Nucleic acid binder design. Structure first.
Length: 175
RNA sequence: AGAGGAAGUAGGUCUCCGUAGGUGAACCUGCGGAG
């Protein structure tokens, strides 16, 4: 018998107050969004450390900016990963014109560039300033990560999107 | 002004917060900030 408690940011508290993991994995839950904690407890119907760690990963992935439409995908498919890239990781210049210009390049007006990158490499990303979070299979996470870091190296989004599309097609192909 | 003669050229998304107005709890728009 093991328990795991996770902290949540003060962003998604109403969305966590929305309504089930006891039905999903037979693992008893408690919540308190004023101490920012969510208790996960394993019962006699709870069988595996896989179920424990996957419930923990599902709740933390809902906490870090994804909704349930992209979180029950993590509850369901075991090939699905999350990777959280800080924009402060590997940096091309020392100059502090970073945050606004970089996430203006990555996000794009009305979400055009983030959305086209998502549709191109089949991954699902969310963007909040310094931290950008990628969800999907880890080769798609590698594709989205190399596209985003080539966006912050200062390459144009048209050329980056073209190369991303051709790499995504060659990765979809079997032989 | 005249019929002839002869010639030549052809780039801030999402979420939250503080605002100000709107039709009020909520909610919408605009702005200023943090993730």
């Amino acid at each position: 018998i093991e328990t795991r408690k996770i902290p949540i940011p003060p962003h998604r508290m109403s969305a966590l107050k929305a309504n089930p993991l006891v039905d999903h994995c037979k693992l008893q839950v408690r919540m308190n969004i004023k101490e920012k904690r969510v208790e996960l407890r394993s019962s006699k119907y709870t069988v595996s450390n896989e179920a424990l760690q996957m419930g923990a990963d599902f709740v933390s992935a809902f906490a870090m900016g994804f909704d349930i439409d992209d979180a029950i995908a993590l509850l369901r498919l075991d090939s699905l990963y999350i990777q959280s890239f800080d924009i402060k990781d590997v940096r091309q210049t020392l100059g502090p014109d970073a945050l606004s210009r970089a996430i203006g390049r990555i996000a794009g007006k009305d979400g055009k560039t983030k959305f086209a990158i998502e549709n191109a490499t089949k991954t699902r990303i969310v963007l909040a300033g310094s931290k950008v979070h990628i969800l999907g299979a880890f080769e798609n996470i590698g594709m989205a990560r190399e596209s985003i870091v080539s966006l912050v190296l200062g390459a144009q989004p048209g050329k980056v999107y073209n190369n991303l599309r051709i790499i995504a097609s060659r990765m979809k192909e079997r032989w």
